[PDB]
Amino acid sequence: KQDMPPVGGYGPIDYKRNLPRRGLSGYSMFAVGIGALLFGYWSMMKWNRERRRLQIEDFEARIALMP
Amino acid sequence: VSMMCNEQAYSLAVEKLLNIQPPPRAQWIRVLFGEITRLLNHIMAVTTHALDIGAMTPFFWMFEEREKMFEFYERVSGARMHAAYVRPGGVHQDLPLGLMDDIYEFS
User: Cα separation of A36 and B95, whole Å?
Assistant: First the structure.
């Protein structure tokens, strides 16, 4: 008399197949790429030109002496 | 791999000769384990293919879940894999108390 089949309690689990967790698509990408890229170029011309100012300063001490 | 899909092709190849239909509780178990060995080939048929190819991690990510299934084989018949379980006279013996809130827990 002690056999298995239970009265209730069932799901089931799915046979489904989906995980569309997107994801900033469709022209939202290529937008964070370009602006941060020119931001790095914007970081230039305030350092290389600044080091160029120090570069003439470095060559200044050479020319002032040597007579 | 197959432990209940083999011997399914043998008792059903013998019971036709002997003019026997198997009893109805027994037929619900041959479909249950006969539709559980396909969840052993179709795991091994992808991972071992994905090892020749050379991927490491889907070999270990699925056999660690496969261990939750050999506990069934040991609980019902006799051993780890190779079970003389299906007979020509239907099922050998009844599966014990349990294995119905386990498979539903597993699946």
Answer: 65
Distance from C-alpha of B54 to C-alpha of B36, rounded to nearest angstrom: 27
Q: Count of CB atoms within 10 A of residue B30's CB?
A: 20
Specified resolution (Å) = 8.3
- Single-letter amino acid code for the residue at A25: S
The C-alpha atoms of residue A48 and residue A56 are separated, in whole angstroms, by 12
Are B1 and B80 in contact by the 8 Å Cβ rule? The answer is no
Q: How far B97 CA lies from chain A's nearest CA (Å)?
A: 7
Fill in the amino acid letter for A10.
Answer: Y
Residue B1 near residue B44, CB atoms below 8 Å: yes
Helix residue ranges, H only, chain B: 8-11, 24-34, 38-47, 49-52, 57-76, 103-106
Minimal-distance CA residue of chain A relative to B93: A3
Closest-CA distance, B93 to chain A, in angstroms, reads 12
Cβ separation of A5 and B94 shorter than 8 Å? no
The whole-angstrom separation of Cα B19 and Cα B7 is 18
Contact, B85 vs B4, CB < 8 A?
yes
